[PDB]
Amino acid sequence: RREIKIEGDLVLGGLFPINEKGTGTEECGRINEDRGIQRLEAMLFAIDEINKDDYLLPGVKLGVHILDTCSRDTYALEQSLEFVRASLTNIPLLIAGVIGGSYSSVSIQVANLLRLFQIPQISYASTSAKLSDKSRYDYFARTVPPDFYQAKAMAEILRFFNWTYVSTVASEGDYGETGIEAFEQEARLRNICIATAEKVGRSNIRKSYDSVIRELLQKPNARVVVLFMRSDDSRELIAAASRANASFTWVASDGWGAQESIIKGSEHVAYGAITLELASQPVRQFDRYFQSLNPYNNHRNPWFRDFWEQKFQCSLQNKRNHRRVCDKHLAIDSSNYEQESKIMFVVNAVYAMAHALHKMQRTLCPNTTKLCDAMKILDGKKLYKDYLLKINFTAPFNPNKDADSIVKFDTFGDGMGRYNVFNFQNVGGKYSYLKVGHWAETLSLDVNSIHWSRNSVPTSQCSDPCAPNEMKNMQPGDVCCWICIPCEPYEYLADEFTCMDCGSGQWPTADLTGCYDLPEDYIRWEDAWAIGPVTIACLGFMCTCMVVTVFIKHNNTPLVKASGRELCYILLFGVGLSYCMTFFFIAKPSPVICALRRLGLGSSFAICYSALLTKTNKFISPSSQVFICLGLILVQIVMVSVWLILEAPGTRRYTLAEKRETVILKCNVKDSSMLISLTYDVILVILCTVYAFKTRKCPENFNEAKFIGFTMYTTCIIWLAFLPIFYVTSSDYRVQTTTMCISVSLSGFVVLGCLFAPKVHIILF
Amino acid sequence: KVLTLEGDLVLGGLFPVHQKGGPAEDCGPVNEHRGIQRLEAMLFALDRINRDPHLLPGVRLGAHILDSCSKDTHALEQALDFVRASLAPTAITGVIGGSYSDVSIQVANLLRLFQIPQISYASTSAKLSDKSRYDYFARTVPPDFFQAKAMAEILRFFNWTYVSTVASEGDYGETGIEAFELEARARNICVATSEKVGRAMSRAAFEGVVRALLQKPSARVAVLFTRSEDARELLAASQRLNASFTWVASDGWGALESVVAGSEGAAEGAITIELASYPISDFASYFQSLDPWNNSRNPWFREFWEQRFRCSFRQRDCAAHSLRAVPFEQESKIMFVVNAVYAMAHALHNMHRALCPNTTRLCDAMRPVNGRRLYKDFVLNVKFDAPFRPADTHNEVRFDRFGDGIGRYNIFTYLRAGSGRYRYQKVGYWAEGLTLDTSLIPWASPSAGPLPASRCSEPCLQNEVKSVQPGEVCCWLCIPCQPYEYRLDEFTCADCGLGYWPNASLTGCFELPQEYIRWGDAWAVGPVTIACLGALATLFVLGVFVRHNATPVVKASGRELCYILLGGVFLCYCMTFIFIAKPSTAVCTLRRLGLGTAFSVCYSALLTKTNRIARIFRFISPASQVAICLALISGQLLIVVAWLVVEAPGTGKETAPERREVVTLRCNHRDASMLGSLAYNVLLIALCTLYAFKTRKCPENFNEAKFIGFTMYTTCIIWLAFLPIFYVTSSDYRVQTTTMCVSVSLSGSVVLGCLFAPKLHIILFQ
Ligand SMILES: Cn1cc(-c2cc(C(N)=O)nc3cc(CN4CCO[C@H](C(F)(F)F)C4)ccc23)cn1
Ligand SMILES: CC(C)CCC[C@@H](C)[C@H]1CC[C@H]2[C@@H]3CC=C4C[C@@H](O)CC[C@]4(C)[C@H]3CC[C@]12C
Ligand SMILES: CC(C)CCC[C@@H](C)[C@H]1CC[C@H]2[C@@H]3CC=C4C[C@@H](O)CC[C@]4(C)[C@H]3CC[C@]12C
Ligand SMILES: CC(C)CCC[C@@H](C)[C@H]1CC[C@H]2[C@@H]3CC=C4C[C@@H](O)CC[C@]4(C)[C@H]3CC[C@]12C
Ligand SMILES: CC(C)CCC[C@@H](C)[C@H]1CC[C@H]2[C@@H]3CC=C4C[C@@H](O)CC[C@]4(C)[C@H]3CC[C@]12C
Ligand SMILES: CC(C)CCC[C@@H](C)[C@H]1CC[C@H]2[C@@H]3CC=C4C[C@@H](O)CC[C@]4(C)[C@H]3CC[C@]12C
Ligand SMILES: CC(C)CCC[C@@H](C)[C@H]1CC[C@H]2[C@@H]3CC=C4C[C@@H](O)CC[C@]4(C)[C@H]3CC[C@]12C
Ligand SMILES: CC(C)CCC[C@@H](C)[C@H]1CC[C@H]2[C@@H]3CC=C4C[C@@H](O)CC[C@]4(C)[C@H]3CC[C@]12C
Ligand SMILES: CC(C)CCC[C@@H](C)[C@H]1CC[C@H]2[C@@H]3CC=C4C[C@@H](O)CC[C@]4(C)[C@H]3CC[C@]12C
Ligand SMILES: CC(C)CCC[C@@H](C)[C@H]1CC[C@H]2[C@@H]3CC=C4C[C@@H](O)CC[C@]4(C)[C@H]3CC[C@]12C
Ligand SMILES: *[C@@H]1O[C@H](CO)[C@@H](O)[C@H](O)[C@H]1NC(C)=O
Ligand SMILES: *[C@@H]1O[C@H](CO)[C@@H](O)[C@H](O)[C@H]1NC(C)=O
Ligand SMILES: N[C@@H](CCC(=O)O)C(=O)O
């Protein structure tokens, strides 16, 4: 057990990580040359400047009880019991205040131990968000800000360089656990995620660090990484990475910062690393004090001999067992001396404790400037509550009067966040840390960082931005990385994760949120191709004009009375509807006209053949017979299909392609059923041809009867030729269908000419 | 004074042997009930444990019992020895200390850093249950807030919902009522009032709080969770006001005569919760057989003997005094200390069994005792029968995942009929399950009511409940919903189709329509039979005329016109007979066709017949008269098809009113749509009137010439009677159809009498 005890009226405790695992197997075999020894000497310098100070604690000498921690919380707890030994009531020494540990876990443990005994504690380097809780850490304070501002700064720098997909590794201690969670929160706030998260602990690098490095190398797509991990573990992790030839850009916290002791002989893996360190003004007085230190005059520090032996490999007063005997002519010159950043923090903590003690002495002993019997017993609770948390003083050694000069304590005994940005660089062949930014609540990064590959290292290449016109999200292995595969073949894809089809007769818009129904091709068909049957309709109008001409002779008392007067007008009615039938087919396929379309075709064809059959076969019966079959056919079809199917056109025929919408859906079904009706319609027409083909041959109208047989002969051939073209009608709803009905119109026009040919022959003659 | 016993394993101990004392002395008077009675119990249990073959057969335990005179600071300094020795007696494997809310907190806070397991025996504070601050702390006594579960179970068993909660100023009442409300939520129990009876207040404040509790009669039960003095004062205040309640007591007021004395009238059926403790048959005998001479192990026994008997050892007069003669009252928290030390012993035995198999003694691996595993894996997972049991069902000594030992509570009820007062009777127990006995409870017996406190009232039916809660959700106050609509949910009654009755009895919101077709025989049997008879007569007349249509057709009007008249009258009769039909689009369009077309053709044929007479007075054209009549009919048919395509015919969903029996008899046809054609039939009627005004009469058809005027007058009268009827019967459906059928039949009969009757008379004459 080694300690530095100085007798005095008031004694200040001290916990520093002098012993730490460097290059060896012992837990704390080596000695910290920048973290422990430097801070111990800074505290001693502050104490012995305060003792000789006249404006601060006049006539009162401040003692020290500096101890070791070995960078372990359990060892710190074991060795901190001497601070409360004198409070029970190696002579006990009463500790007025204890300077906090350098590690978050150690500081937490000492705070928990000292809360019960009411001993104020001020830390200099414990930046942990788990602390500052006035429910379990009542007697604790620190000059450094928590990890919240550090995590915010890390998120800001990650967003500045467009770093989205990163790999993360931290420690298992009280420092890594809370800081890493704060980092996760601040990263998910800024819409960035992490590849994986690892937690390391104080153990051999054979298993844990090697596995961490291998896993990090297993995902080459992520290059930049963060380090919420302690310095003692950081050195071993860097050594393992150098052994495995790592190629990552580390983003370090205040644990590593601008410390050159972590990287020694392995500077090629830490090249280009961006490290975060708290902003501090170097103290020239402390620099001179440390440079004036010698092994001989420094009998106060038991660890100074070991520190000198580790800094310069030689024996101070031992035998020649070491590789050299000290030349006795070398000191700590500026060539190999680098003042630690967190030295002014220790100085400020010591001076704040001294100021609190001095002000309490002044308010408790107004008459004399000396310790009194009333202050023999110290009330730590009241001291911390009022005279420590409400202190405001200029920095002990600062030639400026800026904001940083004033040392204050927040409501939680916290500090202000001004984390500097440091980048590892190689200039002139000498590796050194160069400041490239300053997080004064606003990131102020300068473009001077030297990266690993002399270029801005990219990331998030697995999930690149993609246009939402056809791309879709797919995450087979990890939630973060997505592949923008092309989906939605003419379908809406409003949801980015999944793509689904609009359905039949629907076309998506540019927004991919609402499918639009394209206009029907059958509707508004009167412009280019459907005007073809309009000429046939015009020919049908000429046929209608011909229908006007044929009855003129029949109206003006025709001489030929052999032909039935009623029969002649009956057959003219059938051909008239045939000319008018084609108008419905080429018109707008309205629901009203669909039912009329089938009635027009079925009735006109039936009555035309019925009238011819009756004419071939006193005169009362042929008129009644013609109406009987015509009425029966019209009545039968009424109660068969049209009164049952309830035809209603709609969108259909979109199976072949989504860019096609037929206006008829139920009417198209009736069109398919009309094929059976067409065969039934031609069944009676074909039967009529055979029944009266040169069978009766009445001498009164033998020429007409022979001509009438010719009309039946040409109709069956025309009707039969229409069947093959009706099958390909469905292929062209707005093209083939219009031409399909032209066959009926052509047959009607042909029938009218030949039937009335004997009638017009007499007129011409 | 430090009590140390030789043993392989040394167990710590902290007891309040001395009281708080004055400012001058750290420890004051010696406590003979809470500091020495429990210490001797621990020593006796340790001796029995060391003499138990089945509990550490080879390893003998020791003691390091210390004293904490009810001071947090002194307890901290004493417990510092436990953690200093581990880093010089044997390392303290376990500590059985902790008898106060703050002393236990301090000990747990100090011992958590060094990983020393600790089980308290008398600390009921709920703040120690937070494992985020106390990792290695356990306790045998259940925490004070564990009675909230028993209270909620009792309230649920008695169907009590509108309860009143009373809290205290200290951590006892507060931390209980907090999460007592939470347990009430899980039991569908709401809190009416949350008055806080805390620090010392005058009787005026007590009267005020009892008045605020009684201001609503819906809350007849109160849940007191305060101290004994607060409960006693509340009972006194209630008795002064003479109020009636069913207070549910707690550990503060349990089997205590100092809380209910003087307030017997106020409390008659109060439920009392008391922690169950059983006497030890051997601890009392061990305690009587104790003297300060032989029992030199206890350093404080000399002071106990001096203070208890008011003697001193300097006069040598304490030999006459004896402890066996003095009656012994066992403390309630003695079995808890015994259970705690036995739990430590069982945990050590489990450690030895699962860690040192080959060695029956203290194995080498047991030398570095670690509190983390020993606590977490084993102490929270011990299950053994309680030592020195009276052979009851209290053989369960277990610790929960939060380091809180289970507890058994005795549910007492303050009876008053047996002896007037002081009749605390156990009616059940709470050991992981409610076992209340309603037979012993007076008001639970079938000679009274449960004295309920129900939030408002719930007498509403399933179909007539709205659950509209103004201020109290637990009230479930209901508003009668619409009788013509069902409910969407039990919690929220929503009108599901209020127009017609849905399947309320089937719990579904789907509407259930009734197809009330116009088929009722009362208003149809007559008109249908009349129309059928008229149609049969018209068909017979037409057939008779057609059979002998050789001589009369040429002499009289043309045969085509007679056939047109016959077809028109037949169509009119058919339309009249078929007017009744189901509410379908086909029926509607067929009616719209026929009703107009038959009349139009029947009058157009008559006009054409009159046109032939008018031509006698271009050309007569007998063959073209039928064509002209057909054109006249076709014009009306074109008008009909136009008004049929522009009107979009359909079938109405229902002709019923907003709230009445379901009936569907209306059609898409409207009065304006009917009048559109009625204009054309009015023009036809005007043409017929003009033809009648052409009074020239043929000698063969002299009667028919005047009959045209009769037909026109009949049609005009029918229209002028139907139009006001149509206006009046616009809402009516059955009446309108009957009127239309009657008018159609009358018109058909008039036409038949005008046309066929002269022909029949001529045929009969010939
Ligand atoms: C001499 N006489 C003529 C007819 C006749 C004839 C006809 C016709 N268009 O063939 N349609 C009628 C419709 C109706 C119904 N009304 C009731 C609803 O409102 C409307 C109105 F006009 F009444 F306001 C319609 C009634 C009588 C009709 C009957 N007898
Ligand atoms: C019912 C109406 C609205 C539409 C259909 C009208 C039809 C059935 C009409 C229009 C023209 C009519 C024809 C006109 C003239 C004659 C000559 C006559 O000597 C016998 C009847 C006969 C041959 C008619 C038969 C029926 C007929 C074809
Ligand atoms: C084109 C379609 C709709 C009808 C085809 C048949 C047409 C041309 C026929 C059927 C009925 C016929 C009419 C029947 C009777 C007459 C009366 C006569 O005094 C003059 C001719 C006239 C007016 C006829 C003209 C031609 C006519 C209208
Ligand atoms: C005297 C002769 C020429 C008359 C012949 C009948 C004419 C007028 C009829 C027969 C078929 C009719 C068409 C049938 C269907 C439609 C579609 C509708 O959306 C607008 C009217 C329109 C386009 C009709 C216009 C009039 C029309 C062309
Ligand atoms: C002189 C005669 C032959 C004319 C006959 C015309 C008939 C067939 C026409 C005229 C008006 C037509 C109706 C007009 C509108 C509709 C609504 C539609 O949702 C279903 C079909 C339906 C109900 C039609 C059915 C057929 C219909 C009744
Ligand atoms: C071309 C489109 C508009 C379809 C037209 C269909 C028309 C012409 C049809 C449908 C129903 C048919 C009627 C059905 C029955 C009969 C009874 C018979 O004893 C004389 C013919 C007559 C009166 C028909 C005349 C023509 C008719 C009205
Ligand atoms: C000659 C005059 C007086 C009468 C003619 C009657 C004709 C037009 C009638 C008789 C049967 C009728 C059909 C009967 C049933 C239906 C089904 C319905 O969903 C639409 C109308 C429709 C398709 C009707 C259209 C008109 C129709 C064909
Ligand atoms: C609106 C509708 C119902 C009116 C009637 C339509 C039908 C049934 C009519 C119109 C024309 C009529 C025909 C006109 C002329 C003759 C010649 C006669 O010697 C016998 C009857 C006969 C053959 C008629 C039969 C019925 C007939 C076909
Ligand atoms: C349009 C709807 C009602 C379907 C019925 C279509 C047919 C059957 C109708 C429509 C218009 C009608 C024509 C209208 C006018 C005349 C002139 C007349 O001197 C003879 C009959 C005749 C030639 C009709 C015959 C039947 C007809 C062609
Ligand atoms: C006039 C004679 C010679 C030929 C018969 C023409 C008939 C079939 C024509 C003439 C006018 C036509 C109508 C004109 C306008 C419309 C409105 C439209 O929304 C549906 C079709 C409908 C209702 C047509 C149906 C067919 C129609 C009635
Ligand atoms: C990050 O990307 C933005 C464009 O989204 C660009 O303007 C900016 O310069 C980038 N920052 C870098 C490359 O550091
Ligand atoms: C409480 O109500 C239930 C019905 O919900 C009943 O079964 C039970 O007996 C009641 N408890 C009493 C009356 O103590
Ligand atoms: N701030 C870090 C380490 C500080 C340091 O010692 O450099 C921690 O709390 O562990």
CSV table of N, CA and C in Angstrom, one decimal, chain B residues 72-106:
chain,number,residue,atom,x,y,z
B,72,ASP,N,-29.5,5.6,12.5
B,72,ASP,CA,-28.9,5.3,11.1
B,72,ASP,C,-27.4,5.4,11.1
B,73,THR,N,-26.9,6.4,11.8
B,73,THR,CA,-25.4,6.6,11.8
B,73,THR,C,-24.7,5.5,12.6
B,74,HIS,N,-25.2,5.2,13.7
B,74,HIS,CA,-24.7,4.1,14.5
B,74,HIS,C,-24.8,2.8,13.8
B,75,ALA,N,-25.9,2.5,13.2
B,75,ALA,CA,-26.0,1.3,12.4
B,75,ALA,C,-25.0,1.2,11.3
B,76,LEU,N,-24.8,2.4,10.6
B,76,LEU,CA,-23.8,2.4,9.5
B,76,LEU,C,-22.4,2.1,10.1
B,77,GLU,N,-22.0,2.7,11.2
B,77,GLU,CA,-20.7,2.4,11.7
B,77,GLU,C,-20.6,1.0,12.2
B,78,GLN,N,-21.6,0.4,12.8
B,78,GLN,CA,-21.5,-1.0,13.2
B,78,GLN,C,-21.5,-1.9,12.0
B,79,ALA,N,-22.3,-1.7,10.9
B,79,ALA,CA,-22.3,-2.5,9.7
B,79,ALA,C,-21.0,-2.3,8.9
B,80,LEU,N,-20.2,-1.2,9.1
B,80,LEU,CA,-18.9,-1.1,8.5
B,80,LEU,C,-18.0,-2.2,8.9
B,81,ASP,N,-18.2,-2.7,10.1
B,81,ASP,CA,-17.3,-3.8,10.6
B,81,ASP,C,-17.5,-5.1,9.7
B,82,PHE,N,-18.8,-5.3,9.3
B,82,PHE,CA,-19.1,-6.5,8.5
B,82,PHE,C,-18.3,-6.4,7.2
B,83,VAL,N,-18.2,-5.3,6.5
B,83,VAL,CA,-17.5,-5.2,5.3
B,83,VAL,C,-16.0,-5.0,5.5
B,84,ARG,N,-15.6,-4.6,6.7
B,84,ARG,CA,-14.1,-4.5,6.9
B,84,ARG,C,-13.5,-5.8,7.3
B,85,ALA,N,-14.3,-6.7,7.9
B,85,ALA,CA,-13.8,-8.0,8.3
B,85,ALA,C,-13.7,-8.9,7.1
B,86,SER,N,-14.5,-8.7,6.1
B,86,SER,CA,-14.5,-9.6,4.9
B,86,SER,C,-13.2,-9.3,4.1
B,87,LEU,N,-12.8,-8.0,4.0
B,87,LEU,CA,-11.6,-7.7,3.3
B,87,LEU,C,-10.3,-8.3,3.9
B,88,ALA,N,-9.7,-9.5,13.5
B,88,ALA,CA,-10.2,-9.9,12.2
B,88,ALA,C,-10.9,-11.2,12.2
B,89,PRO,N,-12.2,-11.2,12.5
B,89,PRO,CA,-12.9,-12.5,12.5
B,89,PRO,C,-13.2,-13.1,11.1
B,90,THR,N,-13.9,-14.2,11.1
B,90,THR,CA,-14.3,-14.8,9.8
B,90,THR,C,-15.1,-13.8,9.0
B,91,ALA,N,-15.0,-13.9,7.7
B,91,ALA,CA,-15.7,-13.0,6.8
B,91,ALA,C,-17.2,-13.3,6.9
B,92,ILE,N,-18.0,-12.2,7.0
B,92,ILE,CA,-19.5,-12.3,7.2
B,92,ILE,C,-20.1,-12.8,6.0
B,93,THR,N,-20.5,-14.1,5.9
B,93,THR,CA,-21.2,-14.6,4.7
B,93,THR,C,-22.6,-14.0,4.6
B,94,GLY,N,-23.3,-13.8,5.7
B,94,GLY,CA,-24.7,-13.2,5.6
B,94,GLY,C,-25.0,-12.4,6.9
B,95,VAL,N,-25.9,-11.5,6.7
B,95,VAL,CA,-26.3,-10.6,7.8
B,95,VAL,C,-27.8,-10.7,8.0
B,96,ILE,N,-28.2,-10.9,9.2
B,96,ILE,CA,-29.6,-11.1,9.5
B,96,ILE,C,-30.1,-9.9,10.2
B,97,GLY,N,-29.5,-8.7,10.0
B,97,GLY,CA,-29.8,-7.5,10.6
B,97,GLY,C,-30.9,-6.8,9.9
B,98,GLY,N,-31.4,-5.6,10.5
B,98,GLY,CA,-32.4,-4.8,9.9
B,98,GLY,C,-33.7,-5.0,10.6
B,99,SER,N,-34.1,-4.0,11.4
B,99,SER,CA,-35.3,-4.0,12.1
B,99,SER,C,-36.1,-2.7,12.0
B,100,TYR,N,-35.6,-1.7,11.3
B,100,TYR,CA,-36.2,-0.4,11.1
B,100,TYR,C,-36.2,-0.1,9.6
B,101,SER,N,-37.1,0.9,9.3
B,101,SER,CA,-37.2,1.3,7.9
B,101,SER,C,-35.9,1.9,7.4
B,102,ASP,N,-35.3,2.8,8.2
B,102,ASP,CA,-34.1,3.5,7.8
B,102,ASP,C,-32.8,2.8,8.1
B,103,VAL,N,-32.8,2.0,9.2
B,103,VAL,CA,-31.6,1.2,9.6
B,103,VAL,C,-31.3,0.2,8.5
B,104,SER,N,-32.4,-0.5,8.1
B,104,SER,CA,-32.3,-1.5,7.0
B,104,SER,C,-31.8,-0.9,5.7
B,105,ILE,N,-32.3,0.3,5.4
B,105,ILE,CA,-31.9,1.0,4.2
B,105,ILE,C,-30.4,1.3,4.2
B,106,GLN,N,-30.0,1.9,5.3
B,106,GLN,CA,-28.6,2.2,5.5
B,106,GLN,C,-27.7,0.9,5.4
